[PDB]
Amino acid sequence: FSXLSLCA
Whole-angstrom Cα distance, residue 8 to residue 4? 8
Residue 4: partners with Cβ closer than 8 Å, 6 or more residues away: none
3 residue type, one letter: X
Half-sphere exposure at residue 7, Cβ-oriented, CA atoms within 13 angstroms: 5
DSSP annotation string for 1-8: --TTSS--
Whole-angstrom Cα distance, residue 5 to residue 3? 6
